[PDB]
Design an enzyme around this catalytic site. Structure first.
Site, PDB file in Angstrom:
ATOM      1  N   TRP A  92      -8.845  -1.375   0.257  1.00 57.71           N
ATOM      2  CA  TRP A  92      -9.620  -0.308  -0.262  1.00 57.71           C
ATOM      3  C   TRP A  92     -10.871  -0.916  -1.022  1.00 57.71           C
ATOM      4  CZ3 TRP A  92      -8.744   4.349   1.054  1.00 57.71           C
ATOM      5  CH2 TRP A  92      -7.639   4.615   1.536  1.00 57.71           C
TER       6      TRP A  92
ATOM      7  N   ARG B  52      -5.360  11.403  12.640  1.00 59.03           N
ATOM      8  CA  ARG B  52      -6.664  12.151  13.287  1.00 59.03           C
ATOM      9  C   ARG B  52      -7.606  11.012  14.017  1.00 59.03           C
ATOM     10  NH1 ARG B  52     -11.057  11.235  10.540  1.00 59.03           N
ATOM     11  NH2 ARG B  52     -10.660  10.552   8.366  1.00 59.03           N
TER      12      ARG B  52
ATOM     13  N   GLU C 242       0.788  -1.313   0.104  1.00 54.52           N
ATOM     14  CA  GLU C 242      -0.029   0.042  -0.184  1.00 54.52           C
ATOM     15  C   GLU C 242       0.952   1.178  -0.013  1.00 54.52           C
ATOM     16  OE1 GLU C 242      -1.653   1.650   3.427  1.00 54.52           O
ATOM     17  OE2 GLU C 242      -3.563   1.818   3.011  1.00 54.52           O
TER      18      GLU C 242
ATOM     19  N   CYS D 183      -6.646   9.524   7.506  1.00 55.95           N
ATOM     20  CA  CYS D 183      -6.523   9.446   8.683  1.00 55.95           C
ATOM     21  C   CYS D 183      -5.056  10.013   9.023  1.00 55.95           C
ATOM     22  CB  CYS D 183      -6.474   8.053   9.210  1.00 55.95           C
ATOM     23  SG  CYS D 183      -7.889   7.197   9.152  1.00 55.95           S
TER      24      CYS D 183
ATOM     25  N   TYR E 213      -4.755  10.168  -0.491  1.00 58.42           N
ATOM     26  CA  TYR E 213      -3.392   9.868   0.141  1.00 58.42           C
ATOM     27  C   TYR E 213      -2.227  10.433  -0.773  1.00 58.42           C
ATOM     28  CZ  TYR E 213      -5.464   7.754   4.272  1.00 58.42           C
ATOM     29  OH  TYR E 213      -6.226   7.372   5.402  1.00 58.42           O
TER      30      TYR E 213
HETATM   31  O1  LIG Z   1      -5.146   4.025   7.878  1.00 57.71           O
HETATM   32  C1  LIG Z   1      -6.481   3.958   8.522  1.00 57.71           C
HETATM   33  C2  LIG Z   1      -7.462   4.067   7.954  1.00 57.71           C
HETATM   34  C3  LIG Z   1      -8.929   3.961   8.888  1.00 57.71           C
HETATM   35  N1  LIG Z   1      -8.772   3.955   9.992  1.00 57.71           N
HETATM   36  C4  LIG Z   1     -10.037   3.888  10.743  1.00 57.71           C
HETATM   37  C5  LIG Z   1     -10.247   4.301  12.095  1.00 57.71           C
HETATM   38  C6  LIG Z   1     -11.416   5.207  12.097  1.00 57.71           C
HETATM   39  O2  LIG Z   1     -12.334   4.518  12.671  1.00 57.71           O
HETATM   40  C7  LIG Z   1     -11.826   5.217  10.830  1.00 57.71           C
HETATM   41  C8  LIG Z   1     -11.705   6.926  10.342  1.00 57.71           C
HETATM   42  O3  LIG Z   1     -12.562   7.464   9.614  1.00 57.71           O
HETATM   43  P1  LIG Z   1     -13.751   8.427  10.039  1.00 57.71           P
HETATM   44  O4  LIG Z   1     -13.869   8.091  11.373  1.00 57.71           O
HETATM   45  O5  LIG Z   1     -13.225   9.632   9.924  1.00 57.71           O
HETATM   46  O6  LIG Z   1     -14.827   8.191   9.179  1.00 57.71           O
HETATM   47  O7  LIG Z   1     -11.063   4.472   9.756  1.00 57.71           O
HETATM   48  C9  LIG Z   1      -7.386   3.931  10.808  1.00 57.71           C
HETATM   49  O8  LIG Z   1      -7.266   3.823  11.845  1.00 57.71           O
HETATM   50  N2  LIG Z   1      -6.361   3.998   9.944  1.00 57.71           N
END
Ligand SMILES: O=c1ccn([C@H]2C[C@H](O)[C@@H](COP(=O)(O)O)O2)c(=O)[nH]1
Ligand SMILES: NC(=O)c1ccc[n+]([C@@H]2O[C@H](COP(=O)([O-])OP(=O)(O)OC[C@H]3O[C@@H](n4cnc5c(N)ncnc54)[C@H](OP(=O)(O)O)[C@@H]3O)[C@@H](O)[C@H]2O)c1
Ligand SMILES: NC(=O)c1ccc[n+]([C@@H]2O[C@H](COP(=O)([O-])OP(=O)(O)OC[C@H]3O[C@@H](n4cnc5c(N)ncnc54)[C@H](OP(=O)(O)O)[C@@H]3O)[C@@H](O)[C@H]2O)c1
Ligand SMILES: CN(Cc1cnc2nc(N)nc(N)c2n1)c1ccc(C(=O)N[C@@H](CCC(=O)O)C(=O)O)cc1
Ligand SMILES: CN(Cc1cnc2nc(N)nc(N)c2n1)c1ccc(C(=O)N[C@@H](CCC(=O)O)C(=O)O)cc1
Ligand SMILES: O=c1ccn([C@H]2C[C@H](O)[C@@H](COP(=O)(O)O)O2)c(=O)[nH]1
Ligand SMILES: [Cl-]
Ligand SMILES: [Cl-]
Ligand SMILES: [Cl-]
Ligand SMILES: [Cl-]
Ligand SMILES: [Cl-]
Ligand SMILES: [Cl-]
Lengths: 505, 505
Positions: free
Chosen positions: B308, B414, B286, B394, B334
């Protein structure tokens, strides 16, 4: 016009009715006793003088306290009696006696001068009243002077949390026959309420010129400030362990990479650093500036804030390839990115309404409707805009989070000068949170501060060692004298930061 | 074509000549002695069996170790002699005897099978040779089997740091006349070299069916992994103290706000979590995908990586208002933002060369020329592009920093699922750093990981408690079988992650 962000109706659910922080003056025997039922058992004239001086004297130079700027003492009814009529009311100070039998007039009597106020409730109401719009600029420090019943409330939540210093005169007398008791709890005990008490100062053992050559001593006790202390132990870590680095000018730094800090914003406590005075007036002025999406740096200059002055000069702008910008114009900097992200810049005068992504608004929007959203974050780090800016942003990111109806806020900062940058910016984001909280009808929670390159300047080193010698006191409070119709319409005047007790600027 | 990022000439100054990590098997008396000058004093047949089995047996099911996938034992010359000809060479294993008097042929003799290799140096060279392109996929674990001289090197830097488990058979025999000594140092001691040794297992006291009914016991010792442990104590903190929250689907979470982690990338150590197997093949696949600025998610699918897939379906794309995107097309996600920040998206097939800001390139550029720059950071969080994306990022931010010719990298994220998101992403950024390091002629340093909303899913809770019961083992190593002309041209095949020793997937 609007476009702007409209404020909510009432204050946040189960909200902080503005209080005042206080300090406590007390005398004890070695057992920790204060007065055999009514009054006081022993007689030490030196305490009386030390009492007078602590309670009267303001911060700064020889500034006689007139009604226009003075100190205030809070006592229960029984104590107000206890004071001999020859020194009643207490001169230089605002005698504040709480009562539910006697009113303000009901107490006035020889005759006849209006330096007193009776209050219907306990200490809380006193503090509320003392923090009330007129009393606040005028009244510098509040002192609680007794007795038992008033002290009980002091070491009880939520007073104990507004409690900021204890001056304690210990009398080396002993009997059992002294009824009431006053002990400061040891830290990490149940009674401590999670507060950690420290000696700030402690006098010599001293002998009283009274009838028994009785011993006594003084000591100042302060509630340990872990929060500020984390900032300091970061500074020390850098100085001891930082990598020697050299920035764009060429000045030498010591730096570390990546660290994190937290600060409670709860009940509008405001992490302005005690160990060194911060430029709050500027902080507040700059962030409101940010919040409007402002760019003409002279708005700040005009208001006596000269920081963007260096980076706003005809020279530096040119040095950064900004021919077309007039002096004191910065381009799509911080606040502009906040409110009009991606809007094409031309000049500061130009109307930017409706162009670019208004992050702040959408955030305020989401907060109210959907607190659980993991996407509430604004950025000022715009690669496409960076070249047009007089300066790339340090504080480039902030993410909000809500729990238990409290708003927290993480701030990311790529380059962090502990010298002034950092402490300044902590205050800056603390304010933003508090405001954003107010705009979304939420109480404020935590500021989490994440530092990228954290550094100290080569000059700053020895200065910083002087700072590290100090102990951090307790933090001040932000309190609003007035509210506005729109967030944008807030002004430095609207708020006033109470109980900031630092060491030299 | 280029456009691409061109790799440097040699490997980074004073660089890690790829080594192998190992495990140590040893028997001691209670005093910690191993053999009276030459050989061994006591006779315990149970040790011999326990030796055989530890040294032979591979990970997994009943998989007989053929030359094509087997285990290897490393011994000095004197020990190789010490082995009785009836069991020489050691069956099932690659007898590796270091010598500076005898060569590979010089040792072969009854007759006659090629399961041995002599090496001209000490343990380092062995490990280098064992990690060498052909020996690496084929040889699973390396074991050091003695003696004194070989053990000395094992508990010495830089072997001791590649030392990953000690199996120690204690013999309840005692005399002084045993010459050489083997003691594992207590943690936090000088001799410890800053390593902390822990019991992972320990058998019953057991009695040997030999002539003296002599007691013995086994125990496995592992070098405590603080790094991984911080991840875990974050998970536990969430479970004990997290706020109950509910995401966009509606699933229940426990979350905390703001935390920070670090991981040494030094000598290509690679923080893949031991307490649960990570999908490395996908991770690597990835990120290389990211690095190209790729968007057609089926590139990943085609290569057996289906993540994905959910967010790439005709449905979800439509659910996100992406009519015009063909299935498995994600928009400016990304990597695209990384390489063409602000470039206007249309479709994945479309040529994006030269459009938008190429952050990665400029970073690579700055690193080489000006390491002290406080501005080396790329972002994927583009407010203007976010709506066109199948998914907001994220891991939205990464800032690089250089000290002592080592590259570190802070990553900001985030929204962080500890369940798989996080461990995955740690590996992901670890790789990026290592690569970026390689591209800028620097050794790798630290990954600093900053978490925004950190969470555990309501289902995940009890599962996670099972994980928390385990102890974290030591981390594996990334090693390159091959290099490329351009960073973009790297492939999963090019590297191979050695010594990953987890617990079930
Ligand atoms: O690289 C990644 C991709 C996705 N998430 C997960 C954690 C969260 O539950 C969600 C984030 O998406 P939103 O909550 O903002 O919709 O995806 C990760 O921890 N790391
Ligand atoms: N050693 C020291 O340094 C130290 C310091 C100070 C005093 N002392 C002595 O210790 C003694 C302790 O006695 P004490 O604690 O009873 O004295 P006090 O504090 O002076 O008396 C409390 C009085 O204040 C009023 N009050 C308190 N809380 C109120 C509320 N919530 N709402 C409305 N009114 C409120 C009440 O008067 P109303 O009846 O009108 O409602 C109450 O009787 C004092 O007599 C004093 O001389 C010792
Ligand atoms: N209790 C236990 O479980 C335990 C385990 C194993 C062994 N033992 C015993 O303890 C004794 C310890 O003796 P020992 O340590 O001397 O045994 P050893 O490890 O077998 O002997 C070391 C030999 O390996 C070769 N060598 C080592 N380092 C080298 C280097 N850097 N470069 C080139 N060659 C290198 C040398 O042979 P060249 O002369 O050819 O250069 C050297 O003489 C052994 O005899 C063994 O029987 C005990
Ligand atoms: C009963 N009472 C309360 C009292 C007395 N001693 C204390 N001593 C200490 N350390 N702390 C107090 N809480 C305290 N409170 C009194 C008694 C006398 C005066 C008094 O004579 N007031 C003059 C003192 C002038 C003087 O005697 O030198 C003043 O200016 O404050 C005030 C409060
Ligand atoms: C001298 N030497 C080194 C030796 C002996 N005991 C040890 N015991 C322990 N715990 N650890 C070692 N390092 C170790 N090393 C020896 C002696 C015998 C055999 C041996 O008989 N090899 C057979 C053992 C078969 C058997 O006897 O059951 C094998 O398959 O490994 C190997 C190494
Ligand atoms: O809000 C601010 C603004 C500036 N700085 C200082 C710290 C760094 O020394 C410098 C960052 O600019 P560059 O190093 O990237 O040029 O400015 C801060 O700490 N906080
Ligand atoms: Cl005097
Ligand atoms: Cl009464
Ligand atoms: Cl001008
Ligand atoms: Cl068997
Ligand atoms: Cl010999
Ligand atoms: Cl389709």
């Amino acid at each position: 016009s609007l476009f702007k962000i409209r404020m909510p109706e009432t204050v946040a659910e189960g909200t902080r009715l503005a209080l005042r922080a206080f300090s406590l003056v007390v005398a004890v025997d070695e057992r920790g006793g204060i007065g055999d039922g009514r009054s006081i058992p022993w007689n030490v004239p030196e305490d009386m003088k030390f009492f007078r001086d602590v309670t009267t004297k303001l911060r700064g130079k020889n500034v006689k306290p007139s009604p226009a700027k003075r100190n205030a003492v809070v006592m229960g009814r029984k104590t107000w009696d206890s004071i001999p009529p020859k020194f009643r009311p207490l001169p230089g100070r605002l005698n504040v006696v709480l009562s539910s039998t006697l009113t303000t007039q009901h107490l006035l009597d020889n005759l006849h001068a209006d330096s007193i106020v009776a209050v219907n409730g306990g200490l809380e109401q006193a503090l509320q009243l003392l923090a009330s719009p007129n009393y606040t600029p005028s009244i510098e420090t509040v002192y609680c002077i007794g007795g038992g019943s008033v002290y009980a409330e002091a070491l009880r939540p939520p007073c104990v949390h507004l409690l900021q210093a204890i001056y304690r005169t210990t009398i080396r007398a002993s009997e059992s026959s002294c009824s009431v008791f006053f002990r400061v709890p040891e830290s990490g005990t149940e009674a401590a309420a999670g507060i950690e008490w420290q000696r700030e100062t402690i006098s010599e053992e001293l002998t009283s010129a009274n009838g028994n050559e009785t011993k006594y001593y003084f000591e100042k006790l302060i509630p340990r400030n872990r929060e500020e202390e984390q900032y300091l132990s970061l500074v020390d870590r850098i100085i001891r362990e930082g990598n020697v680095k050299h920035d764009r000018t060429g000045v030498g730094t010591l730096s570390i990479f990546g660290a994190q800090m937290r600060f409670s914003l709860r009940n509008n406590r405001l992490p302005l650093l005690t160990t060194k005075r911060v430029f709050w007036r500027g902080v507040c002025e700059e962030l409101l500036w940010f919040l409007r999406g402002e760019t003409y740096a002279k708005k700040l200059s005009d208001k006596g804030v000269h920081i963007w002055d260096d980076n706003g000069s005809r020279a530096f702008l040119d040095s950064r390839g900004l021919t077309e910008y007039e002096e004191m114009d910065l381009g799509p900097v911080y606040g502009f990115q906040w409110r009009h992200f991606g809007a094409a810049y031309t000049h500061h005068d130009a109307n930017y309404d409706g162009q670019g992504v208004d992050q702040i608004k959408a955030i305020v929007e989401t907060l109210k409707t959907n607190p659980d959203d993991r996407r509430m974050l604004f950025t000022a780090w715009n690669p496409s805009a960076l070249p047009r800016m007089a300066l790339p942003p340090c504080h480039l990111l902030a993410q909000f989070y809500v729990s238990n109806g409290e708003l927290s806020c993480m701030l990311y900062q790529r380059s962090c000068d502990m010298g002034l940058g950092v402490p300044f910016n902590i205050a800056s984001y603390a304010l933003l949170t508090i405001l954003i909280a107010k705009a979304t009808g939420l109480r404020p929670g935590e500021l989490v501060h994440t530092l990228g390159d954290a550094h100290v300047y080569s000059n700053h080193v020895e200065p910083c060692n002087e700072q590290l010698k100090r102990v951090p006191r307790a933090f001040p409070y932000l309190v609003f004298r007035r509210e506005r119709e729109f967030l944008e319409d807030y002004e430095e005047g609207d708020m006033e930061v109470i109980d900031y007790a630092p060491y030299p600027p």
